[model samples]
Target: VKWSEDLANLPSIDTQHKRLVDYINDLYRAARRRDMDKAREVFDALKNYAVEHFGYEERLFADYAYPEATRHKEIHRRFVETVLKWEKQLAAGDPEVVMTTLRGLVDWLVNHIMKEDKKYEAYLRERGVS
Candidate 1:
């Protein structure tokens, strides 16, 4: 079963949020196949989409006048930077790296959703999206 997360119940942001989860699973499957090239490809797709999603969030925050828009974008920027750093360190297909990536990803996604993303629920409701 494919589980989706959208705590705020907003159609757009919530579905896109779950897209991140789907990307993580894609990455895991690529790793399970033990293909470095495939892992890199999946990583790029996932990471690139995340960057795009940040833009989406920024748009929502700005459109709804979220008080913390700037701060929230900054948080996203920093996390993206860290992911880039990990990629620079060559996180392709070693068993250790793959396992570590899975753990890190799950932790990051959970924290971001539960803490940061969920904060926008009220704002979404204000926009008639929730």
Candidate 2:
């Protein structure tokens, strides 16, 4: 999937979010080629980017006094934990872990952005927070 297509709104967030999609795609390609080293590298990049993205969004919600900020952060925490769990499995040489993680990552991204992330955008806009 094209990163741009996945991130169609919230330009500021989309700009950074596209990078996460790229990282995920890259990791998937590496895994398809059975390049564990490359996959691990991309996984690390994706994890770092996701952390940065979540932190930035959380700060925006906090600044805007978004009512759901705590719950939103909890979602981010769960996502990170899930990814880290897969990362540990990958590190342990689990053969099917990469494909499994890839599917979960894509699903999580689609659902989180379309459902949860948009809520923050709506809330911020309602509060007149650019």
Candidate 3:
């Protein structure tokens, strides 16, 4: 998987997205191999990194006083919950759920970056977010 054309527009965020995509690819490979342990391992990495990434983005949004920060934080919370649910399924060897969840993650991550993430940009740069 590759980074989508619509980026986060922040170097750190964009880089993290790339890494997340890589982890998703790893998950996909493990799923294809039907390797439950590897899939769980890759997912653990993905989840931990995603949590870190969410925290970073939310903190930056707050620092810039982005008006939608509250909404974005809620989005993150829901994502964490969803991920936790999938992780539980994965731990139980539900390959189908894990496989689809991999796709779900990629879709949601790309959509959020291209859509919601883009919406955050109009204000922060003008306030010297550079």
Predicted structure with the largest TM-score when compared to the true one: 3
Q: What is the C-alpha RMSD of each candidate to the true structure, in Å?
A: 2.3, 2.3, 1.8
Off by over 4 Å in 3: none
lDDT of 3 by residue, 7-103 (tens): 6566666778889988998998888888989999999999999999899888888788888899888998999999988888876776787778988
TM-scores for all candidates? 0.87, 0.87, 0.88
How many pairs collide in each candidate, listed in order? 0, 0, 0
**Candidates' C-alpha lDDT:** 0.77, 0.82, 0.83
Indicate the worst ten consecutive residues by lDDT in candidate 2: 1-10
Candidate 1 residue pairs in clash (backbone atoms < 3 Å): none
lDDT of 2: 0.82
Residues 1-130 of candidate 2 have per-residue lDDT tens digits of 6644434556788887788888888988888888888888888889988999999999898787888898989999999998888888778664367888888999999888887887777667666655
Q: Give the TM-score of candidate 1.
A: 0.87
Q: Global CA lDDT of candidate 3, please? A: 0.83
* TM-score head-to-head 2 vs 3, winner: 3
The numbered model that scores best in lDDT is 3
